């Protein structure tokens, strides 16, 4: 039969007109029966809330205590299966308090009853249903009409109005569940009583629907006005005087104000919920008339619009010139003879920026920008996916509206809905081939005017919005939508990067950086951030001129009239309001204007249509407005509510600037055609909305009460059943967990909603078994379970993960905790036989086995849609692109993939992606999941999907009630599941699959306190020490710690990534050569972001990698995925915080699953047979290291970039004999001027820039350092202090001394020049395991332990006292203990001397601190601390277990106290600065005396050592420093001259022996001033003295001789 009532939830907006159309002069038979069923007294359809307050149910109608105990048990096992402990109690107590309160249980049982009524009537063959008693109220449904009756009184409504009321009760249930959970889990108390008061309040407001729904419209603006009033006392609120909320209902205003005094964040969260309050009618009387009146208003005269349009085209050309010269360093063309500035004609040739140029508008009228690129019509298919339906060609709008509504209002039948009138999806109509060719689709835009069939705009009222008049969101034809996609991509890829306003907004790193700058400035308040909200942003443009720049953008893309149709398109678009059951009149097959329901040919293009061109227009007039008043601008803007960062001007102080700037922007923007009122902008550091996310002072608000109460559209190409609702609930919990909502709140809400949906769809026989209901959740969607928030790690972790060990650990905890045996787990799971590998393998996936679970609905989406497009589309189009079927050739490819051993996932994925079969399969993969394709794919396959729903319901009823056991899983459960997961893959696939198995953090890592963690069992660990004790406040405020040719480039990345392994498999080369010929490329042989929610918490924690026994030192890196480990630690901390405990101690992750740590098998893949598609349509080290040097040089040049774009390991394996040479070559061959050099001199002596941080990251372990022939010359030559001072005196040295440069001037590579910058990083990542440098020499420092000759005995003569750093070496050699315990109160550089000593195994008292060992490893260069100090015992120690340095008080600890005076007649050391106390007793450690040693590199300081043959040249080097630094212009040389003075005083003790200036372009220095222009500014010295003095003066400059002589 015909399917009735096809929606389980409502997406359409509400209207009460069809109720009034049914009440008078009904014609359809079910309308007549609805009139018969209603009583004499009918309440209005807007007043339906007054009927729905009176609906009371008999309390405790559903016995759900088994659901309560089941939910407690499910929460207990998911808490214990994450191996966290304290979070059992608070979660189930919050669930119990949700299910125990009488009003919340009444609302929730109303939700269960509503869902049972819907599940009995949705997808039901019977048309009308009998009287169903919802509590006290009788509901009787006939066809589409719904009759609600409480005794005498009644309300008549639609089925969509019934879904609006049912979704109101549903979203109220979601809000109440999430509010009990959130009030139990967040810093503020119970939300619950506020919503309980507000429901009775909104049903107790004695107003008509227009007035209290106007209050509903102003819930968010008046709460925002109250927040702006209370938070800003200097600037008064502007929205507080326009609305009627304080006057119409004083108790409501009192409650909102009380919530404001408690917490304005609480007020914004409560005010931000949408549909827990009743659905408004979207203001048919007033609001649609007001919006369509504002869409066609003419507010300003065209003369000022004309002049101001030139005034803003000037600043558009200014911004595009600034971007193009900042990127490509070419000035766009300038005007010459009839009127221009001559300095700009000079500056075009010279290519120099003019700062006073941008303040002038009349000169950029003269300066016109040349074409720079061409328009590419074809876009990516990954941005045409969703978020907007289409009209086929001006025919869907007749189909949308009710024939009955138009029949009663206008007396004609509208000739009924004519047809389906094309697919509602943009994708389905695009791929069908009517509008397939995108240049042929956009050629009407190239002609200058659109076709008549495309110019339509049907305005959809946005449900789930506070504003009840709302933004009637636009919906155009396919041609206009493809125009929007291609033009937005053309701006975002090219033009928006060339515009400084939007180069921040489109680049994600630059968007984060702009958001960080805004969050600092709006909270400091010195230069605060304001917001120009534009209520009529879409309506305020004009069809004659939009204040446009499209005339210049048309020339820059070399297109003709393509954006000039954009300004004329507001004339073309016919506007229709898509309120459901609303008639606008049809005139001639086209609408006629009435001003309320329709408006033909308005002044605007559409609501939300063409957002980015309009964004440039609004931003251009605002920046020329702020440039006329000389205040520095930034803009965050993409659409409505455009936010402008204000800085401090040179004209007025920031308060006077602030008020003057608001008045000036009102005057100028009012002149621009957007009539800004006094309310729409505010001079306040309060609030802004960006990217459909609200921000209060830059902090994003918790959207838990809004997003979870927002019901999911769901049923995506699927029949409405259990599994689709569970998967959409899981994805909603994931989307909450990404958008600043705690995934434990999401998990508790998901468990509650899970068991509610089970109670809708299951009999009580399953329900009365508590242990079975506990069993049902924890299986997982891979091995035969339903999708839960519990069993999806993707909710918690990032996109790519392998959930199999987590599911099996869940099942282990299920067996061990509950009374459920292994046989009951077996009968629930039903693992089955699962033979053959024949179909497509699951790699970097959820990793389903060959068994497909019986609970997942087997919707095909590669047979039925393929047969539908084969039968329907007689035109081939997308068919004639794929000559043969996609999955057959891809499956033959997978059968050939079955032959190989290495089975690498990413390699196969990228090589598959080079083939066009992946392009077609990605189109079909886009057909599987979308929000637009569902609207056309649910309408097909009628009455079989309802039978699928009933059949799946009975199938899962039989499956969950099965007995004994289905298939055996008994050996796999106990112990670990390394061999068991490989056995499941080897059983389902018949062969061992490697590279797909990611050993999970649930097994391998047990979170612990260090007192709770064991050292000798749980070896490797990642510990996250906090800077502050976290609370629920700490998840809101940040801390100090920090966060297609592309396929061809990635294929070549894989190519020269295979050169790491030194395996020469010819089959690999032949298959990738065939795929390169498939590409058609010219050269055959071419030479901690985390999830985001816990990002704020991660700003208070640190991260490391401290796994040094058996997994880090190997050449083949073991399987640890670090970012998921970091995320797991952050979620454990978040759980401990939201329970009620505090993170006051560092927490580590404990090594339990010892077998799961697998070493990678470095083996190359072999394809046995040639692929049948074939397309349809010198050593690398020298060039890598030279290009690495010039990359460091250019990154340091552009700092005054982010150089962490590499694998960290491969540079440590790479030799750096060859890096340093062309690090110097670029800086000697650039030959910059003095003022440009000044910034590079200034920057490098401070620890600034990501380049310096990446250089300090790669200089922790360095066998590369000792091998470098400059470094074994320069380290004898200059004084090296730290890592930063050595590297800074290394890279800056080609500027300031050519003397060492001329020694190694005769070396360069000829193959260096024929290497592009897109190949160099590939050659850096090509020589990793070619040679790993496995020597890692311990450059042994002063070992003592005996009697021998004095070799110098130095340790840290530059930073600390040198006598303190020797006794750390000297204690442990007397103890003869390989173990030592170090606490982080010791300076990290001092401990480096202790860590140089070989044959130790140091187990520190870290408290588990990641940072202390990372510092004393980072100070190292030789690598004795990466090897001897073996960490996974040290990182799991909180206190004294062996001989301990570092705590001031401890049982048997070695403590260091500074001694101010001692004789200490000892040949090794001159004195004893720090006395050592062994086990808190002092022992004289002077018996230890030095020995002959090996080669040293650190902590012994070669230039102040015995060697002087490099120091004689170092004197010439420091005189080169001082002759170069005076010639450097625009620099205050205080610290660099101090470093020169350090080197000069060190040199002056050897020579036997202060005005700085230049006379006659030659630097002459003495202590006495030669002229008026001159500016006034240890025992190692004994060993640095040498015999036969006078040879230093041989080959010495005369200026150095004048420098050394005093006066």
Smallest distance, other proteins to C-beta of residue 551, A: 5
The two tokens of residue 466 are 């506070």
Check residue 253 and give left, alpha or beta (phi > 0: left; psi -120 to 50: alpha).
alpha
Question: For residue 651, how many other CB atoms are within 10 A of its CB?
Answer: 11
**Nearest residue (CB) to Zn ion, 789 versus 999:** 999
Helices of type H across 1017-1153: 1045-1055, 1066-1079, 1095-1098, 1122-1139
**Nearest residue (CB) to other proteins, 369 versus 1240:** 369
Smallest distance, Zn ion to C-beta of residue 749, A: 30
Choose the one of other proteins, Zn ion, none that binds residue 548, judging by a C-beta under 5 to 8 angstroms depending on kind: other proteins
Choose the one of other proteins, Zn ion, none that binds residue 302, judging by a C-beta under 5 to 8 angstroms depending on kind: other proteins
Return d(Cα 1091, Cα 740) in angstroms, integer. Answer: 9
Smallest distance, other proteins to C-beta of residue 450, A: 10
Phi, psi at 926, each rounded to 5°: -70, -35
Q: Are 1152 and 1018 contacting, i.e. CB atoms less than 8 angstroms apart?
A: yes
Smallest distance, other proteins to C-beta of residue 335, A: 4
Q: At what angle do helices 1180-1199 and 1250-1258 cross, to 10 degrees?
A: 140
Return d(Cα 240, Cα 679) in angstroms, integer. Answer: 9
Smallest distance, other proteins to C-beta of residue 601, A: 5
Q: Are 1247 and 1286 contacting, i.e. CB atoms less than 8 angstroms apart?
A: no
Q: Which of 94, 582, 977, 1091 binds Zn ion (CB under 5 A)?
A: 977
**Nearest residue (CB) to other proteins, 544 versus 659:** 544
Scored b (16 or more CB within 10 A) or e, 951-988 reads: ebeeebeebbeeeebbeebeebbeebbbebbbebbebb
Smallest distance, Zn ion to C-beta of residue 834, A: 21
Choose the one of other proteins, Zn ion, none that binds residue 1567, judging by a C-beta under 5 to 8 angstroms depending on kind: none
**Nearest residue (CB) to other proteins, 333 versus 1140:** 333
Choose the one of Zn ion, other proteins, none that binds residue 337, judging by a C-beta under 5 to 8 angstroms depending on kind: other proteins
**Nearest residue (CB) to other proteins, 624 versus 786:** 624
Quick note: the x/- pattern for Zn ion over 1142-1181, rule CB under 5 A, is -----------x--x-------------------------
Total residues found in the chain within this entry:
1607
Return d(Cα 699, Cα 695) in angstroms, integer. Answer: 5
Question: Residues touching Zn ion: how many (CB under 5 A)?
Answer: 6
Q: In angstroms, how far apart are the furthest CA atoms of the chain?
A: 124
Choose the one of Zn ion, other proteins, none that binds residue 1003, judging by a C-beta under 5 to 8 angstroms depending on kind: Zn ion
Helices of type H across 424-499: 426-431, 438-447, 478-490
Smallest distance, Zn ion to C-beta of residue 74, A: 23
Choose the one of other proteins, Zn ion, none that binds residue 1332, judging by a C-beta under 5 to 8 angstroms depending on kind: none
Return d(Cα 1556, Cα 1586) in angstroms, integer. Answer: 30
User: Taking Cα atoms as reference points, which of 994, 1166, 1163 lies closest to residue 1068?
Assistant: 1166
**Nearest residue (CB) to other proteins, 305 versus 431:** 305
Phi, psi at 174, each rounded to 5°: -60, -45
Choose the one of Zn ion, other proteins, none that binds residue 1467, judging by a C-beta under 5 to 8 angstroms depending on kind: none
Choose the one of Zn ion, other proteins, none that binds residue 977, judging by a C-beta under 5 to 8 angstroms depending on kind: Zn ion
Place of tokens 């209370």: 230
**Nearest residue (CB) to other proteins, 361 versus 1254:** 361
Looking at residue 1575, the DSSP 8-state letter turns out to be E
Strand 137-142 to strand 132-134: parallel, antiparallel, or no bridges (unpaired)?
Answer: antiparallel
Return d(Cα 1219, Cα 1189) in angstroms, integer. Answer: 5
Phi, psi at 1000, each rounded to 5°: -85, 160
**Nearest residue (CB) to other proteins, 336 versus 947:** 336
Stretch in the footprint of Zn ion (CB under 5 A) among 240-248, 928-936, 1002-1010, 1073-1081? 1002-1010
Return d(Cα 428, Cα 407) in angstroms, integer. Answer: 32
Smallest distance, Zn ion to C-beta of residue 976, A: 4
Choose the one of Zn ion, other proteins, none that binds residue 525, judging by a C-beta under 5 to 8 angstroms depending on kind: none
Smallest distance, Zn ion to C-beta of residue 1003, A: 4
Place of tokens 């009788």: 138
User: Taking Cα atoms as reference points, which of 1164, 995, 932 lies closest to residue 1065?
Assistant: 1164
**Nearest residue (CB) to Zn ion, 976 versus 1533:** 976
Smallest distance, Zn ion to C-beta of residue 1153, A: 4
Question: For residue 1305, how many other CB atoms are within 10 A of its CB?
Answer: 13
* 810 in contact with Zn ion (CB under 5 A): no
What burial class does residue 36 get, using C-beta atoms within 10 Å of its C-beta: 0-12 exposed, 13-18 middle, 19+ buried?
Answer: exposed
Smallest distance, other proteins to C-beta of residue 312, A: 11
Choose the one of other proteins, Zn ion, none that binds residue 309, judging by a C-beta under 5 to 8 angstroms depending on kind: other proteins
Choose the one of Zn ion, other proteins, none that binds residue 560, judging by a C-beta under 5 to 8 angstroms depending on kind: other proteins
Binding site for other proteins (CB under 8 A): 302-303, 305-306, 309-310, 313, 333-338, 365-366, 368, 374, 446-449, 543-545, 548, 551, 555, 558-561, 564, 567-568, 570-572, 601-603
Smallest distance, other proteins to C-beta of residue 566, A: 11
Q: Which of 1003, 1078, 1409, 1473 binds Zn ion (CB under 5 A)?
A: 1003
Smallest distance, other proteins to C-beta of residue 353, A: 20
**Nearest residue (CB) to other proteins, 447 versus 816:** 447
Check residue 556 and give left, alpha or beta (phi > 0: left; psi -120 to 50: alpha).
alpha
Return d(Cα 1505, Cα 387) in angstroms, integer. Answer: 71
Phi, psi at 1006, each rounded to 5°: -110, 115
**Nearest residue (CB) to Zn ion, 781 versus 999:** 999
Choose the one of other proteins, Zn ion, none that binds residue 336, judging by a C-beta under 5 to 8 angstroms depending on kind: other proteins
Smallest distance, other proteins to C-beta of residue 341, A: 13
Choose the one of other proteins, Zn ion, none that binds residue 196, judging by a C-beta under 5 to 8 angstroms depending on kind: none
Choose the one of Zn ion, other proteins, none that binds residue 241, judging by a C-beta under 5 to 8 angstroms depending on kind: none
Q: Are 1176 and 1316 contacting, i.e. CB atoms less than 8 angstroms apart?
A: no
User: Taking Cα atoms as reference points, which of 990, 1008, 929 lies closest to residue 724?
Assistant: 929
Return d(Cα 173, Cα 179) in angstroms, integer. Answer: 10
| 407-to-77, 390, 519, 580 alpha-carbon distances in Å | 59, 26, 55, 14
Q: Are 121 and 5 contacting, i.e. CB atoms less than 8 angstroms apart?
A: yes
Choose the one of other proteins, Zn ion, none that binds residue 982, judging by a C-beta under 5 to 8 angstroms depending on kind: none
**Nearest residue (CB) to other proteins, 446 versus 1206:** 446
Smallest distance, other proteins to C-beta of residue 1207, A: 43
**Nearest residue (CB) to other proteins, 184 versus 313:** 313
Choose the one of Zn ion, other proteins, none that binds residue 591, judging by a C-beta under 5 to 8 angstroms depending on kind: none
Strand partners, 477: 391
**Nearest residue (CB) to other proteins, 69 versus 345:** 345
Smallest distance, other proteins to C-beta of residue 572, A: 6
Dihedral of CA atoms 1394, 1396, 1398, 1404 in degrees, nearest 10, equals 50
Choose the one of other proteins, Zn ion, none that binds residue 1510, judging by a C-beta under 5 to 8 angstroms depending on kind: none
Q: Are 1060 and 1184 contacting, i.e. CB atoms less than 8 angstroms apart?
A: no
**Nearest residue (CB) to other proteins, 444 versus 1087:** 444
Smallest distance, Zn ion to C-beta of residue 996, A: 15
Q: Which of 155, 729, 976, 1500 binds Zn ion (CB under 5 A)?
A: 976
**Nearest residue (CB) to Zn ion, 779 versus 1156:** 1156
Residues near Zn ion (CB under 5 A) are 976-978, 1003, 1153, 1156
């Amino acid at each position: 039969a015909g399917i009735n009532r096809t929606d389980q939830s409502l997406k359409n907006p509400l209207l009460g007109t069809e109720v009034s159309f049914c009440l008078k002069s009904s014609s359809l038979p079910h309308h007549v029966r609805a009139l018969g069923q209603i009583k004499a007294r009918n309440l209005a359809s807007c007043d339906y809330y007054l009927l729905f307050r009176q609906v009371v149910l008999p309390p405790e109608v559903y016995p759900i205590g088994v659901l309560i105990r089941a939910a407690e048990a499910i929460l207990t096992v998911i808490v214990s299966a994450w191996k966290l402990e304290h979070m059992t109690k608070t979660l189930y107590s919050s669930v119990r308090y949700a299910l125990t309160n009488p009003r919340v249980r009444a609302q929730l049982e109303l939700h269960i009853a509503y869902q049972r009524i819907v599940g009995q009537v949705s997808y039901s063959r019977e048309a009308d249903i009998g009287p169903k008693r919802l509590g006290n109220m009788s509901l009787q449904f006939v066809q589409s009409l719904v009759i609600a009756t409480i005794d005498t009184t009644s309300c008549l409504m639609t089925y969509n109005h019934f879904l609006a009321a049912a979704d109101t009760a549903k979203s109220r249930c979601h809000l109440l569940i999430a509010s009990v959970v959130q009030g139990a889990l967040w810093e503020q108390g119970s939300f619950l009583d506020h919503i309980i008061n507000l429901i009775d309040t909104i049903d107790s407001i004695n107003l008509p629907h227009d007035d209290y729904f106007t209050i509903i419209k102003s819930i968010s603006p008046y709460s925002q006005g109250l927040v702006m009033g209370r938070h800003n006392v200097s600037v008064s609120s502007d929205f507080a005087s326009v609305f009627t909320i304080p006057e119409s209902c004083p108790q409501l205003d009192s409650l909102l104000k009380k919530l404001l005094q408690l917490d304005p964040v609480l007020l914004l969260m409560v005010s931000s919920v949408q549909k827990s309050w009743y659905f408004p009618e979207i203001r048919m009387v007033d609001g649609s008339r007001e919006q369509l009146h504002k869409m066609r208003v003419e507010l300003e005269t065209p003369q000022a619009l004309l002049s101001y349009g030139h005034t803003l085209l000037s600043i558009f050309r200014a911004e595009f010139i600034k971007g193009y010269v900042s990127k490509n360093a070419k000035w766009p063309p300038v005007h010459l003879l009839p009127g221009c500035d001559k300095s700009i004609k000079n500056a075009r040739e010279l290519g120099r920026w003019s700062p006073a140029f941008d303040r002038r508008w009349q000169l950029f009228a003269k300066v016109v920008i040349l074409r720079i690129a061409d328009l590419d019509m074809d876009p990516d298919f990954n941005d045409i996916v969703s978020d907007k339906a289409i009209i086929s060609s001006r025919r869907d709008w007749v189909f949308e509206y009710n024939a009955a509504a138009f029949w009663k209002k206008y007396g004609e039948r509208l000739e009924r809905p004519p047809a389906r009138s094309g697919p509602s999806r943009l994708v389905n109509a695009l791929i069908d081939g009517r509008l397939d060719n995108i240049p042929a689709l956009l050629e009407p835009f190239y002609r200058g005017a659109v076709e008549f069939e495309d110019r339509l705009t049907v305005l959809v009222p946005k449900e789930k919005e506070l504003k009840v008049k709302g933004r009637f969101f636009s919906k155009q034809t396919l041609a206009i939508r493809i125009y929007q996609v291609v033009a937005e991509a053309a701006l975002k890829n090219e033009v928006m990067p060339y515009l400084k306003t939007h180069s921040m907004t489109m680049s994600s790193t630059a968007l984060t950086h702009l958001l960080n700058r805004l969050s600092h400035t709006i909270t400091k308040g010195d230069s605060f951030v304001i917001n120009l909200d534009y209520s009529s942003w879409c309506n305020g443009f004009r069809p004659e001129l939009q204040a446009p720049i499209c005339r210049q953008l048309d020339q820059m893309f070399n297109c003709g009239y393509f954006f000039r149709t954009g300004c004329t398109l507001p004339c073309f678009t016919t506007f229709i309001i898509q309120d459901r059951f609303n008639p606008p009149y049809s005139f001639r097959g086209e609408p006629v204007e009435d001003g309320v329901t329709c408006a033909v040919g308005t002044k605007t293009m559409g609501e939300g249509m063409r957002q980015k061109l309009w964004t440039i227009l609004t931003s251009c007039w605002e920046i020329i407005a702020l440039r006329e008043i000389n205040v520095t601008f930034n803009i965050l803007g993409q659409g409505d509510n455009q936010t402008i960062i204000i800085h401090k001007s040179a004209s007025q102080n920031n308060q006077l600037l602030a008020e003057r700037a608001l008045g000036a922007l009102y005057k100028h923007a009012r002149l621009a055609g957007h009539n800004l009122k006094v309310e729409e902008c505010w001079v306040s550091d309060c609030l802004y909305e960006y990217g459909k996310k609200l921000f209060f002072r830059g902090v994003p608000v918790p959207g838990c009460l809004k997003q979870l109460s927002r019901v999911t559209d769901s049923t995506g190409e699927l029949f409405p059943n259990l599994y689709s609702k569970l998967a959409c609930l899981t994805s909603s919990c994931l989307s909450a967990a990404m958008a600043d909502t705690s995934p434990w709140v999401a998990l508790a809400t998901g468990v509650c909603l899970y068991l509610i949906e089970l109670y809708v769809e299951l009999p009580p026989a399953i329900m009365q078994d508590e242990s079975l209901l506990t069993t049902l959740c924890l299986v997982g969607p891979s091995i035969g379970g339903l999708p839960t928030p519990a069993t999806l790690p993707s909710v918690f972790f990032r996109g790519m993960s392998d959930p199999l060990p987590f599911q099996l650990a869940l099942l282990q905890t299920l067996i061990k905790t509950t009374g459920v045996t292994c046989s009951l787990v077996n009968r629930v799971v039903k693992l089955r036989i699962a033979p053959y590998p024949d179909w497509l393998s699951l790699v970097t996936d959820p990793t389903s086995l060959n068994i497909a679970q019986v609970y997942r609905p087997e919707r095909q989406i590669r047979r039925w849609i393929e047969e539908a497009i084969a039968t329907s589309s007689h035109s081939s189009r997308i068919a004639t692109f794929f000559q043969q079927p996609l999955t057959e050739m891809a499956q033959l490819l997978a059968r050939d993939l079955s032959t190989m051993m290495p089975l690498r996932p990413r390699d196969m994925s990228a090589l598959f992606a080079l083939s066009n079969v992946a392009y077609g399969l990605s189109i079909i993969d886009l057909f599987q999941k979308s929000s637009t394709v569902v609207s056309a794919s649910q309408a097909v396959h009628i009455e079989d999907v309802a039978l699928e729903s009933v059949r799946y319901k009975e199938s899962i009823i039989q499956g969950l009630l099965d007995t004994t056991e289905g298939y055996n899983m008994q050996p796999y459960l106990e112990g670990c599941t390394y061999l068991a997961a490989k056995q499941l893959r080897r059983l389902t696939w018949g062969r061992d699959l490697v590279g797909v198995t990611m050993p999970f953090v649930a097994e391998q890592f047990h979170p612990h306190s260090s007192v709770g963690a064991k050292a000798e069992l749980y070896l490797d660990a990642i510990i996250y020490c906090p800077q502050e004790t976290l609370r629920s406040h700490h998840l809101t405020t940040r801390g100090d710690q920090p966060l297609a040719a592309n396929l061809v480039k990635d294929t070549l990345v894989l190519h020269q990534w295979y050169k790491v392994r030194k395996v020469t498999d010819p089959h690999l080369n032949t298959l990738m050569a065939r795929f390169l010929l498939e590409k058609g490329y010219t050269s055959d042989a071419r030479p901690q972001g985390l999830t985001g929610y816990v990002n704020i918490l991660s700003t208070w924690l640190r991260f490391s990698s401290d796994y040094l026994h058996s997994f880090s030192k190997s050449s083949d890196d073991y399987t640890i995925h670090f970012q998921h480990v970091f995320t797991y630690g952050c979620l454990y901390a978040d759980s401990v915080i939201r329970s009620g405990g505090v993170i006051s101690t560092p927490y580590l992750l404990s090594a339990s699953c010892k077998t799961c740590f697998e070493k990678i098998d470095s083996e190359e893949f072999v394809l046995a047979c040639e692929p049948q598609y074939r397309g349809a349509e010198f050593d690398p080290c020298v060039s890598a290291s030279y290009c690495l040097g010039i990359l460091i040089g250019k990154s340091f040049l552009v700092d005054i970039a982010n150089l962490e774009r590499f694998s960290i390991s491969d540079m440590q394996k790479l030799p750096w004999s060859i890096v340093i040479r062309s690090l110097w070559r670029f800086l000697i061959g650039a030959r910059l001027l003095q003022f440009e050099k000044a910034g590079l001199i200034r920057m490098l002596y401070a620890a600034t820039g990501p380049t310096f941080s990446f250089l300090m990251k790669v200089f922790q372990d360095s066998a590369l350092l000792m091998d470098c022939a400059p470094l074994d010359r320069l380290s004898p030559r200059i004084n090296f202090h730290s890592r930063g001072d050595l590297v800074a005196k290394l890279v800056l040295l080609p500027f300031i001394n050519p003397g060492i440069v001329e020694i190694e001037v005769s070396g360069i590579n000829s193959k260096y020049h024929a290497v592009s910058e897109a190949n160099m990083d590939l050659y850096i990542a090509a020589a990793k395991s070619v040679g790993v440098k496995p020597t890692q020499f311990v450059e042994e420092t002063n070992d003592f332990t005996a009697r021998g000759h004095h070799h110098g005995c130095y340790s840290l003569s530059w930073s600390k006292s040198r006598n303190q750093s020797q006794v750390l070496k000297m204690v442990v050699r007397k103890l003869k203990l390989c173990v030592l315990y170090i606490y982080p109160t010791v300076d990290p550089a001092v401990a480096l001397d202790l860590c140089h000593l070989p044959a130790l195994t140091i187990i520190l008292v870290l408290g588990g601190d990641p940072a202390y060992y990372e510092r004393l490893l980072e100070m190292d260069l030789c690598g004795a601390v990466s090897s001897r100090v073996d960490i996974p015992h040290s990182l799991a120690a909180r206190t004294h277990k062996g001989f301990t340095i570092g705590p001031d008080t401890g049982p048997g600890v070695i403590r260091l106290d500074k001694l101010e005076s001692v004789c200490y007649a000892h040949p090794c050391l001159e004195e004893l600065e720090f006395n050592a106390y062994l086990d808190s007793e002092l022992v004289d450690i002077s018996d230890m005396c030095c020995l002959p040693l090996a080669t040293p590199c650190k902590a012994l300081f070669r230039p102040i050592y015995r060697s002087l043959q490099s120091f004689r040249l170092a004197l010439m080097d420091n005189y080169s420093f001082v002759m170069d630094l005076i010639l450097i212009r625009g620099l205050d040389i205080r610290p660099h001259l101090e470093e020169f003075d350090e080197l000069l005083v060190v040199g002056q003790h050897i020579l036997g022996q202060y005005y700085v200036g230049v006379v006659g372009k030659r630097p002459v220095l003495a202590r006495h001033p030669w002229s008026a222009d001159l500016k006034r500014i240890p025992s190692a010295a004994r060993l640095r003295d040498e015999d036969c003095q006078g040879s230093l003066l041989v080959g010495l400059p005369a200026g150095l001789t004048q420098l050394l002589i005093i006066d």
